[PDB]
Scaffold this active site. Structure first.
Site, PDB file in Angstrom:
ATOM      1  CG  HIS A  62     -23.062  43.073  -9.909  1.00  0.00           C
ATOM      2  ND1 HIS A  62     -24.135  43.946  -9.897  1.00  0.00           N
ATOM      3  CD2 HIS A  62     -23.586  41.827  -9.940  1.00  0.00           C
ATOM      4  CE1 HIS A  62     -25.261  43.253  -9.912  1.00  0.00           C
ATOM      5  NE2 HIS A  62     -24.956  41.967  -9.959  1.00  0.00           N
ATOM      6  CG  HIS A  92     -14.245  41.001  -6.910  1.00  0.00           C
ATOM      7  ND1 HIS A  92     -14.250  39.874  -6.122  1.00  0.00           N
ATOM      8  CD2 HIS A  92     -14.711  42.002  -6.143  1.00  0.00           C
ATOM      9  CE1 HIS A  92     -14.734  40.182  -4.930  1.00  0.00           C
ATOM     10  NE2 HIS A  92     -15.021  41.468  -4.927  1.00  0.00           N
ATOM     11  CG  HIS A  94     -15.440  46.593  -4.814  1.00  0.00           C
ATOM     12  ND1 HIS A  94     -16.785  46.309  -4.829  1.00  0.00           N
ATOM     13  CD2 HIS A  94     -14.815  45.473  -4.397  1.00  0.00           C
ATOM     14  CE1 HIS A  94     -16.968  45.084  -4.357  1.00  0.00           C
ATOM     15  NE2 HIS A  94     -15.789  44.553  -4.120  1.00  0.00           N
ATOM     16  CD  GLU A 104     -16.857  47.096  -1.632  1.00  0.00           C
ATOM     17  OE1 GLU A 104     -16.447  45.970  -1.337  1.00  0.00           O
ATOM     18  OE2 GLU A 104     -18.009  47.344  -2.096  1.00  0.00           O
ATOM     19  CG  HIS A 117     -12.502  42.727  -2.165  1.00  0.00           C
ATOM     20  ND1 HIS A 117     -13.796  43.203  -2.172  1.00  0.00           N
ATOM     21  CD2 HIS A 117     -11.812  43.521  -1.318  1.00  0.00           C
ATOM     22  CE1 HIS A 117     -13.870  44.272  -1.404  1.00  0.00           C
ATOM     23  NE2 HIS A 117     -12.681  44.480  -0.864  1.00  0.00           N
ATOM     24  CB  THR A 196     -18.764  44.402   0.214  1.00  0.00           C
ATOM     25  OG1 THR A 196     -18.222  44.112  -1.078  1.00  0.00           O
ATOM     26  CG2 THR A 196     -17.740  44.290   1.287  1.00  0.00           C
TER      27      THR A 196
HETATM   28  C1  LIG Z   1     -24.436  32.539  -2.405  1.00  0.00           C
HETATM   29  C2  LIG Z   1     -23.299  31.860  -3.088  1.00  0.00           C
HETATM   30  O1  LIG Z   1     -23.438  30.880  -3.808  1.00  0.00           O
HETATM   31  C3  LIG Z   1     -21.927  32.433  -2.880  1.00  0.00           C
HETATM   32  C4  LIG Z   1     -20.802  31.396  -2.981  1.00  0.00           C
HETATM   33  C5  LIG Z   1     -19.543  32.171  -3.405  1.00  0.00           C
HETATM   34  C6  LIG Z   1     -20.010  33.625  -3.432  1.00  0.00           C
HETATM   35  C7  LIG Z   1     -19.224  34.616  -4.285  1.00  0.00           C
HETATM   36  C8  LIG Z   1     -17.748  34.641  -3.882  1.00  0.00           C
HETATM   37  C9  LIG Z   1     -16.982  35.709  -4.685  1.00  0.00           C
HETATM   38  C10 LIG Z   1     -17.626  37.104  -4.587  1.00  0.00           C
HETATM   39  C11 LIG Z   1     -17.360  37.696  -3.187  1.00  0.00           C
HETATM   40  C12 LIG Z   1     -17.946  39.075  -3.070  1.00  0.00           C
HETATM   41  O2  LIG Z   1     -17.825  39.581  -1.748  1.00  0.00           O
HETATM   42  S1  LIG Z   1     -16.717  40.631  -1.429  1.00  0.00           S
HETATM   43  N1  LIG Z   1     -17.028  41.946  -2.324  1.00  0.00           N
HETATM   44  O3  LIG Z   1     -16.885  40.915  -0.030  1.00  0.00           O
HETATM   45  O4  LIG Z   1     -15.451  40.050  -1.785  1.00  0.00           O
HETATM   46  C13 LIG Z   1     -19.436  39.054  -3.355  1.00  0.00           C
HETATM   47  C14 LIG Z   1     -19.633  38.507  -4.760  1.00  0.00           C
HETATM   48  C15 LIG Z   1     -19.115  37.085  -4.985  1.00  0.00           C
HETATM   49  C16 LIG Z   1     -19.291  36.771  -6.470  1.00  0.00           C
HETATM   50  C17 LIG Z   1     -19.864  36.015  -4.135  1.00  0.00           C
HETATM   51  C18 LIG Z   1     -21.391  36.040  -4.345  1.00  0.00           C
HETATM   52  C19 LIG Z   1     -22.084  34.934  -3.547  1.00  0.00           C
HETATM   53  C20 LIG Z   1     -21.489  33.558  -3.839  1.00  0.00           C
HETATM   54  C21 LIG Z   1     -21.721  33.140  -5.321  1.00  0.00           C
HETATM   55 ZN   LIG Z   2     -15.433  42.677  -3.306  1.00  0.00          ZN
END
Ligand SMILES: CC(=O)[C@H]1CC[C@H]2[C@@H]3CC[C@@H]4C[C@H](OS(N)(=O)=O)CC[C@]4(C)[C@H]3CC[C@]12C
Ligand SMILES: [Zn+2]
Length: 258
Positions: A62, A92, A94, A104, A117, A196
């Protein structure tokens, strides 16, 4: 048939697996600059990245994620709208297929070419997995990218992307200093929101910097050479990995600046 950014699995489909997609504090949002209220009680942001220790970079299908060692209290965000201390875990981006889209958050409906982000978790919850179950679990620092002059502090990231072209590839990525990705000003907007991407958890205090960083056309072109797909699968360029603005509902966006 997992979620993504295409016609058949993109943002308008996410609510089926993740009903919180239609919730009360979803992100991103449009920041209407004239309606955002200056809040003189907001403190300056404290960004302390001097001891940040990057470990690795990962294509997760992603985006690409630069991950940090968060085993100690090093790289921390505090102040601003936050209570307590939040530890950097990863960053990361977008971005778009074209320079005219990719962010975003939007500002008076303006879309930037990309959005960075920097993701931090509230140390009072002990780890990031527990933090995302709480309404004040994460603080995400959002920084807009526009295309113009190159950002020299981004180039180490751009140059490693050839080695993680496809989903599931990772590369060692130590000693990367995220201070090189920050604009001059720390003036910000803030509001309560969500991740997001799925699982779209409503656990984020958003802090979106007013000042974009400039990156070169060549830098963002290299983001657009990545692939959503795994090695040996049909090639799908990793572009337009942004969720559109969501309804503000019963929320106020606050400005740190007049
Ligand atoms: C459900 C879970 O385990 C969470 C803990 C940390 C989270 C991650 C933190 C870092 C980023 C944040 C990101 O959100 S954002 N785009 O608003 O910054 C969604 C993906 C991800 C990989 C997240 C996905 C859901 C994760 C793995
Ligand atoms: Zn993000």
């Amino acid at each position: 048939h997992h979620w993504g950014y295409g016609k058949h699995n993109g943002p308008e489909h996410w609510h089926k697996d993740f009903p919180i997609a239609k919730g009360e504090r979803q992100s991103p949002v449009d920041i209407d600059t004239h309606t955002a209220k200056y809040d003189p009680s907001l403190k300056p942001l404290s960004v302390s990245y001097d001891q940040a220790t990057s470990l690795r970079i990962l294509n997760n299908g992603h985006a690409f994620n630069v991950e940090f060692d968060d085993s100690q209290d090093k790289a921390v965000l505090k102040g601003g709208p936050l209570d307590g201390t939040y530890r950097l875990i990863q960053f990361h981006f977008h971005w778009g297929s074209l320079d005219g889209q990719g962010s975003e958050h939007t500002v008076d409906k303006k879309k930037y070419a990309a959005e960075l982000h920097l993701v931090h978790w509230n140390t009072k919850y002990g780890d990031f997995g527990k933090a995302v179950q709480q309404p004040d679990g994460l603080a995400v620092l959002g920084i807009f990218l526009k295309v113009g002059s190159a950002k020299p502090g981004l180039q180490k990231v751009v140059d490693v992307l050839d080695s993680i072209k496809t989903k599931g590839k990772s590369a060692d990525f130590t000693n990367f200093d995220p201070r090189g990705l920050l604009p001059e000003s720390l003036d910000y907007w803030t509001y309560p929101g969500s991740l997001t991407t799925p699982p779209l958890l409503e656990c984020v205090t958003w802090i979106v910097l007013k000042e974009p960083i400039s990156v070169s056309s060549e830098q963002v072109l290299k983001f657009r050479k990545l692939n959503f797909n795994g090695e040996g699968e049909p090639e799908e360029l990793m572009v337009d990995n942004w969720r559109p603005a969501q309804p503000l509902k019963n929320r106020q966006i606050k400005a740190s600046f007049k």
